């Protein structure tokens, strides 16, 4: 990194750059190193470590409005083995909750676990808000979901700006307690069959914060939630609608086939 | 205490007993003091602090099977002001969820928040177990409850040994989503009137972990949950049954009158 | 309070209750007192202060999921004197920005400054999110606003669930750069005159975070912001629309008359 | 004040309002009172003082971006007696520096000392900047000045936006070392006599930071100071020009007549 | 350093010079070292640490007019990865704002982030001034900028002394909302072609405080801002002019080619 | 020290001398230690600390006429780096202000900053006197100076007893606005050439308080300043004369060669 | 102490003896402690502190004729470093004032400063008396002195009962303006040589109050000072005589050798 070269040159310690080069220390690494970490890599003199730590302070906290802290954020898909207890529980939900296609079961090919730090922080913050409003009860449920935007949810999170405008209950994000109600939404690319039996179809088994849900029995077209409520529970097979993207987390990614 | 007198006498430091007497240091206090806390109260010599700390170690860790660490645990009822948002949320649930007596609403007198450390630890541990079993979803809901043992639940927690043996779905602990379904269970002490409009009734608004619930539509006399399931959801107004005492937490205590 | 009585009784220190009574120490106060504050009120024994602090820890942190910390949050309206520089600046904006009624100026009666803590925290958190998305630029402006919910905005903040459904650019919150464009939205209660010259009108001069705005030149019915954008800028006098309530803060409350 | 009424009502201490009313405590006064100041006015319970201090903190520091701290800023003109040493020194400068009218001396009526906190802070900050640039030397001199904006300078300070556009050395602020060079700029209101011997003329004896001055000998039209320099020194009787308003302070206000 | 040798010799502690030599303690380091920092490097005797701390006090605070505290001030250019969200946002602005050359897009080679402590401090101080004047509104926008003095801005900040005297709205610093409006100002060094497709052009994406802007529609030649205003917004593609260098901060440095 | 042994022996606390020996506490150190500083070094008993503090009081204040407080006074020369802004400013003055030898520029070897506490106190006290006399204007300027006594000014300050008795304007201390006028006064030690191009000639860049200066155009032989005036400004290249040593401070020490 | 045990036992507060024992509080310490000091050491009850303070009052003030207040009085010799300014001044006097042995200079070994409180109080009281007599002029000088009683003067002050009865001007105390006249009075112990060049001779450089001195030119045998005069000045090298011991103070103690 050339950032650390300029930093060290500005401090006047450009004779430490051989050490910083051989230890592959970058600025984003040097920010989080104290006296112990700096002495481990061979900065023995106290004066040099004092200078480096003060210079890091007068960059991180001295330019807070600049936010110079530009520090590996991404999604990690942790595949589950078919003999794992979590795999069996998710499969049990996926199958037993069946109630489109002419199927009676599914062929679970793989189940993966979505792990994103930033989306988890967003979800937990909104969960805390909803909890504080709803007498310390988030009313959290695990529901299925399909939308054309699946490869993008597991990377950028749910987005209400990509809403399902043409829906029964308005421009929200639609979750189904039954896996059938969610794979009815799918679509076929290659084989023109609607009920294709060789289709590699993907489903999300998300983690939804409902809070105070508005029990609705007819159809409406809400753009946002009704006042005082955080979600919509519509029975025209119940289906749940949220209007804030940060209020659901993509928990699992299920790949399966009609069978 | 006379315990600290024996302890200090055994260590041979019986000249520190004026310090320990004026600072009201007891054994259950001395156990949790290090070098810093012991120097704050005026044990300046390093040898004395070393002796005290070693003697505490050779009592807490040296007799781990004795469990000599006998250290105040109790319920603290925190009254919620009627202008607080949590009070209004619980009241909204209490009222709007109605669907015995010839009433249409309630006269909420006071809502208190139950705070017990030990019961919370039990509940959270069982919640972790149920979560691990149920693919990391506790399936936690807030449901009402009435029982003859109300002043005992808020002090010792729910007990399945005090089960509703003569119940529709067996010997469990019965929770209702509707407040009316729960105050139908009450009983009048002073008046003979069943619908006493001046009765001080108490209701629990608990926090119940259901896990994988068994959807049951008829009556049965289960002693424990059906295999593979953590609770029973019976719709003969839905009513929920748990067969483990540690799987619910008494959250709020509502005192009210029929109105 | 009776909560502190139970707490102190559980610790076994019920002889400190005269101190806690004459100094009007409650639980919400006792939570934030350390050794120093506890000795200031006359708890001289180290054992007693240790016991109180440990008992507070084993209630605040030991039951963190309970959130037992129930601690005066509300709106404080700070009247600005007409000789103040801020009053003159807001008045200059209000007047010079005019471009309904047959008026040319206003009769500014009073300008107040809305001061809420919780709403400010919400606004600043959303500002941080929008800034991180928009290359560290919130794109913040103050714009005028009128809505039937004015005495409710200054107390509970902007709410998109109270959206202007029948608006030009959809169900958002409409802000106008011109004071006239916003006082055209008003409505007379007592007089039948639309242009009542003796009407006490209220106008909000709010602080709005636009982020990356969508320049739209026609009318559409956005339920939420267009993908990738945080607001809508409409020029059918430009008018700005946000679709998230936490993305504006009610800054000033202006009371005026047509003149 | 009503702001303090709302504040105290929010804290729940509205029974202290009689104390706050008889002692005329406002919010801008309550902000700067600690435990001892609050006990001096009769708030004896520690809990109440703790509540007030925490509430003030959660308003001053908890809304720092709001800047709710709206706290007697103005100019105080302190008249100097003619027998004072400072009056004599300023008079000696005024007279001896003569070198329009056909006069030889002045009739000094009164000399006043301008005292403003805000303008002094501005001037000292710019002085620090100029000193740091110019090897810790501000190069500060006391020079005379006349402008149509004299009753405005002593209240709002010097302003380069009110520049002398039609000047010899550009759009700056022109100061002269000789008093005659500065009273040549005056204008006659009542009498038509340009050399009116009964005119109540006002002159400023300011305090100017010249920094690194650009020695010029011909006329030019600098919009701003030349690069690397903080002022212009022109000798076409030398006259000094500054292009920053915050780089001079109105020190004395001299009223006199031609004589 | 030889300064610390004289300092320690004057205090009479010249036997500590081997410690100060092996730890590379210089005066600028010793100034910021207290009791714990001085005991870390092995100054165990209390008398010596007392002497050193007192001598540093009687040098830093005892000669405040000298400002002897001469203490890594410089610019650090932090290169952004093309896959970072901030890079994509700045590139989106750069491209989408196009409306010289015969181009339709740009070829962004690299984007760097300018980080200077002193320039940030200046910018934030002037931002606070402008905010206090303009009813707590800096009116901050990010605009593009090209000037012959680009390699000097990122190191010394904007300077109105290097103004654009030959400009349409006077001698100010010209910023453009559109990137094309700002690269129309460029100039070709090596090729005679003005529209060279192989030229490395640098553009600044600055952070400009506008405050209260004077909407002007014709041309004029202000040297400084119109009275009561902090900037000029001139629409003859709108262009913005500031007359104070401290009122914009170079946020990004964009290197690109025409494509 | 042996003074502290006598002091502690007189107090009767000679059992604390091992502590005072290991911590190298001397009398000049013990004078400045209170209760907390005495407890930090292990004087735990209140009686002993009380005795020590009272004995120190009855030694410093009880013998004020003796002035027994004999406490690191000396000059600290702080070298300036050639890339520093202050170095460049002093160099710019030194070069640009030239107008003996046949040279045109100087070769600046090194610039040092003179830091003496006592001389600064003397200079600032006389500055305050001169300011009070001259209507709160010290009329401070930085001018060059050469004298045979250069290594003595930086250590003992300017002295009018070492006056230039054979001067044009009398027995004063002659400062020059131009560096050439000041280096004409030098003298050659090694080489016989008076214009030796390899001589390390030293110069002072002082900080003089001129106050109210007497403009003289001819020669005179003043022993002291003319009545009512604090200095003499002579133009027979203007040269400034002060007749009081404490009215200038040696700010920098410039070492250079003719080039 | 045992006095404090009796005192506290008489007050009836013998349960405070552990505090008074661990804090090493003695009677001479307890006399000077008020409410603040008594609370700092852990006497929290107001009754106990009131009793202690009243008992101390009824012992110090209630028995004033007893003078029970028997409270570190002694001489503290402070050695001066040979590089100190005061050392150099005293040495300059010591050497330059020469005008027995055949020497020309001295070899100053060490100079010490005598610091006694009681002797200083005596000397200053007599100085004030003599000042009041002699129109507010003590006529104080610093003169040399040798007497067989030097180690006794520095501890008990000058004494006219040890008068030089065999003197030229009577039974007074003889001081000399020249060090030579004072070291002619010496005597050799180890070597038989009166002019022993390796003899450690001690001389006093006192601080004598002469008041109104009687100029004498012949010898006489005054037992006391002549009427109306406070001292005798004799020029038979002038020598000064005082007849009251409290009218001089032994300031420095000079140890030297003939050289
Ligand atoms: Zn297919
Ligand atoms: Zn009843
Ligand atoms: Zn009306
Ligand atoms: Zn007139
Ligand atoms: Zn090219
Ligand atoms: Zn030479
Ligand atoms: Zn001998």
Residue numbers in the entry:
A (entry chain S), B (entry chain C), C (entry chain D), D (entry chain E), E (entry chain R), F (entry chain Q), ...: 875 to 945, 950 to 977, 986 to 1073, 1081 to 1129, 1136 to 1158
Q: Could you give the paper's own sentences about this structure?
A:
The poly-ADP-ribosyltransferase tankyrase (TNKS, TNKS2) controls a wide range of disease-relevant cellular processes, including WNT–β-catenin signalling, telomere length maintenance, Hippo signalling, DNA damage repair and glucose homeostasis. Notwithstanding, our knowledge of the mechanisms that control tankyrase activity has remained limited. Both catalytic and non-catalytic functions of tankyrase depend on its filamentous polymerization. Here we report the cryo-electron microscopy reconstruction of a filament formed by a minimal active unit of tankyrase, comprising the polymerizing sterile alpha motif (SAM) domain and its adjacent catalytic domain.
TNKS2 SAM–PARP forms a double-helix of antiparallel, left-handed protofilaments. SAM–SAM head-to-tail contacts within each protofilament match those observed in previously determined crystal structures and involve the canonical end-helix and mid-loop surfaces. Interprotofilament contacts involve a distinct surface situated between the end-helix and mid-loop regions. The PARP domains protrude outwards, connected to the SAM domains via an incompletely resolved, partially flexible linker, and decorate the major groove of the SAM double helix. PARP domains extending from one SAM protofilament do not contact each other but alternately intercalate with those extending from the antiparallel protofilament on the opposite side of the major groove. PARP domains engage in alternating PARP–PARP head-to-head and tail-to-tail contacts. The head interface occurs close to the donor site, with main contact areas provided by helix α2, the donor loop (D-loop) atop the NAD+-binding site, the C-terminal portion of the β6–β7 loop and the β8–β9 loop. The tail interface involves reciprocal contacts formed by the α2–β3 loop, strands β3, β5, the β5–β6 loop and helices α1 and α2. The head interactions are highly conserved among tankyrases and induce an allosteric switch in the active site within the catalytic domain to promote catalysis.
